[PDB]
């Protein structure tokens, strides 16, 4: 009856009920091809079909409703929409529309949208009020994401770590660099576990770029949330074409006075994917990554912001470093000073089986005041006036001992105040 | 009526004007958008429009009126000069042109310049006769502006220091030299905040290149002062597109015996712009930068005088070294001696959690007899003779205790000729 | 209807022949113009035509002109481009009294080939080029004159001594832009200026 659960459906239960509804060689055909298939012939029983995506407008001007459970990649089950519907209900890329469809008139290959009652989760007339997320005057961050979990186990003291080491508040725009090989996969997991749990209601998305299918499907299994993803099989146009989905997404549910977290994987590859895609403009850098190819990640990466009038928008990105490549590192350059938070992992840490891997000296935060108490970030500056003098090496190990012997953060605090 | 107090409206007061006048889908669109098509309808009407802006005369011949509120960013709102108003007023880049503006004829996209009564805050035919700024002859700076606030708080020291540190005056050149993560972004605003309670007579001009976003709306919201800046993920194309309308700009003021103070940041970062915008000369020296390429600030910076025939330019730029890049400890040796102020911070004072970090000993002004008093300029010398011998971490740490116990420091002056 | 429009504008006798004559009349209308034309330089009278167009013409000489056994590329005799050679070749000026003056209009582009191979035919015979640039006409540019190709031959006769070295550092600064540019770079220059004298230093100012 509704797309949108035949997608979550799995595919052995999408063969048994195209069987009885007549349909057959199903099961060698791909699972869009056979959710197509079950549409089309329960539309020509006549009871109505239903339909929910997110808008990608081209430049032709027709538009397409893309699923997240295929990460929004170009399908036959997708949605069609005319330009009349752009003019007469005014959206956006990235808009989510949620309304009945109709079969698809012969000599077309694509449902068509009948009409509209759901944009953004919201009627469409107040959709069309909605103040464009450019205007909106961007401000630091005031509320800071709680990353303990009481629920977590002593074994893991990422979530601990993080802290103290650089506290996250809404709207944040912190970038993690590290080594390959250095835990970083794992860090956005624990990530993802302390603001799915601590804060269950800001909006959690998880975009990955050229990484292994293995890895894709453990991100949906274990982050609750919506997770898309691009493999490296897949061509550069494709890596490119999910970030902008994904922001304008991400985009258009601040302007609804919305959170919305993206755990961004990672910036050095999705520069990579657009440096490719756009052409030589007849100025090469340093390791051959054009000027302009840069300025389209910059603006990605750029948008996270505290919105004053409400809502926030979190970007946490991870920059690959000493990877062995002369574009890696020229990419890392350019996105140095750019975010308020750094978060900084150390390959000789990683080496030595002790994780997390983070260097407590070089990681930090700009204008941390506005995130933490008085007294917490006190009790943070005294911290950093007995780690600075050791070793990064030795660094880590003191606070995981620490931490260790002690149930939650504070009394860790009052521990170092007793010597 | 008017197009300076649209841009000053906030968005939803012009969601709401617009509705009223006939326009509609207007949320969706840029705030740059919403006042073209404001002005459009209110065209039609009959009533007369006017207008102010900033001249950037291009190459063509042909020039634009760009509005400090978007940071001199080019825009559907920008009014269009034809070169004949150049030629019958006889105007140059910088200029502030207001008067009366005509409704785009097709074929055009951009509104047009009726008349012109205001030039530079003067009458037009006045602002004809102004001499050119090259043509002043400069001077060392005569009269000094105060740093210490009455209102300003203990808690705060950092005015106060600098008077100690190094006085400046009108005309002065200063270079700040700091290490990231510093304090140097928060050291301007405390200049800023005394520019404009001291001296509310000065223009005060805050330039913010390669900033993030949230840095610039504090310091709009804090500043009382224009003030503009260019964001990373804008090319680099626009970075010195910014620089060179407010020193034009400011040129101008200074030609009508006005003051003119300009509190830039960084000047590290504005050289990176230069040298990738102007192409390669077949010379590269070390870093990559090219010898021609730093000509342009040089000029930039070194433009900061005190004109004798009257008004003064004061720029003080904020130098970064230790970024741990080749390319920028090469900048700050070609601007090692440009400057007649220096004020070092100090990293390893920062850490201690002791702010101002200034190195006292390092950080000086030359010519110091013009600023200061007899009295006051021999009581700097013995307090000098006291600081040197001790250590420059201390050094802070001593003036911080003794200034907290002073109200002001004449009083501290006092309490030093006591022991 | 073009021909009437020139009547009524042009200030003087204008004659012309109609798509729907047939060829003999074309060729008798142009051979009557320049004999007239050619008595009238005789006393001492300056006679102006304006040719419209060259590319035509040949065409209506070539079909009333019988083959002599010899045909070039597109279908054009030899000998039957000699008349019109001889027709425009008339203009020249009278050391005794009077002058000659001959402009055509050349039609290239024109997708036929025997346009083509015409225009190459009278490709030096004049003093006098001046090229029009269809990608300027499409930008809606007017006049679409091609300055850098356009020019004329032994112009130091024409023109004074100042005026003649004034359009050289014109042509100096010209050259180097695109000649889709140059027309608009004129047409900005020429519209401040109320005279071509003003515009002459204006240029030298910068
Ligand atoms: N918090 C942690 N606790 C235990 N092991 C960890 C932790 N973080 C990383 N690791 C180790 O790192 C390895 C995975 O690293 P990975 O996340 O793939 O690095 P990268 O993503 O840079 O390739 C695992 O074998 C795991 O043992
Ligand atoms: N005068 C001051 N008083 C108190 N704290 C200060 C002062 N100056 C700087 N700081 C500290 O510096 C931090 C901000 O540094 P910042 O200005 O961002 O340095 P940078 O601009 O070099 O990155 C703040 O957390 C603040 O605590
Ligand atoms: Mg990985
Ligand atoms: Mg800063």
């Known amino acids: 009856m ?6 979550n ?3 052995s239960e999408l063969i048994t009920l195209g069987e009885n509804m007549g349909l057959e060689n199903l099961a060698r055909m791909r699972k869009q091809d056979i959710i197509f298939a079950i549409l089309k012939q329960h539309a020509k029983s006549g009871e109505d079909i239903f339909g929910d995506g997110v808008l990608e407008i081209l430049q032709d001007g027709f538009g397409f409703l893309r699923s997240a459970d295929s990460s929004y990649l170009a399908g036959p089950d997708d949605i069609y929409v005319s330009p009349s519907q752009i003019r007469r209900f005014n959206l956006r890329t990235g808009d989510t529309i949620s309304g009945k469809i109709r079969p698809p008139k012969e000599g077309e290959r694509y449902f068509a949208l009948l009409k509209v009652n759901e944009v953004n989760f919201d009627k469409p007339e107040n959709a069309r009020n909605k103040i464009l997320f450019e205007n909106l005057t961007p401000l630091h961050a005031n509320s800071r994401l709680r990353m303990e979990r009481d629920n977590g186990s002593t074994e893991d ?7 103290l080491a650089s506290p996250i508040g809404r709207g944040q725009r912190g970038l993690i660099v590290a080594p390959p090989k250095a835990g970083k996969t794992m860090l956005l997991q624990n990530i993802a576990q302390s603001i799915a749990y601590n804060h269950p209601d800001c909006v959690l998305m998880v975009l990955l770029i050229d990484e292994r ?9 274990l982050v609750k949330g919506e997770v898309v993803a691009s493999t490296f099989d897949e061509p550069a146009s494709r890596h490119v074409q999910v970030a902008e989905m994904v922001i304008e997404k991400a985009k258009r549910l601040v302007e609804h006075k919305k959170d919305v977290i993206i755990l961004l994987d990672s910036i050095t590859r999705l520069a990579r994917a657009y440096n490719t895609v756009v052409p030589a403009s007849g100025k090469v850098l340093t390791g051959g990554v054009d000027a302009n190819a840069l300025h389209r990640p910059k603006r990605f990466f750029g948008a996270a912001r505290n919105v004053e009038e409400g809502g926030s928008l979190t970007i946490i990105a991870t920059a690959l470093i000493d990877t062995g490549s002369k574009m890696d590192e020229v990419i890392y350059e350019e996105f140095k000073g750019t975010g308020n938070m750094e978060l900084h992992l150390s390959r000789k ?13 070089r990681s930090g935060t700009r204008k941390e005041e506005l995130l933490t108490t008085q007294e917490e970030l006190q009790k943070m500056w005294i911290l950093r006036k007995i780690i600075h003098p050791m070793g990064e090496i030795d660094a880590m190990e003191f606070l995981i001992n620490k931490l260790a012997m002690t149930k939650t953060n504070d009394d860790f605090f009052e521990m170092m105040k007793r010597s």
């Open 2 to 7: 509704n797309l949108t659960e035949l997608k």
């Open 9 to 11: 459906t799995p595919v």
């Open 157 to 163: 003291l990422t979530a601990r770590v993080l802290d």
């Open 213 to 221: 299918p293995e890895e894709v499907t453990e991100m949906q299994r």
């Open 349 to 361: 840490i990683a080496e030595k089986r002790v994780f997390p891997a983070i260097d407590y000296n």
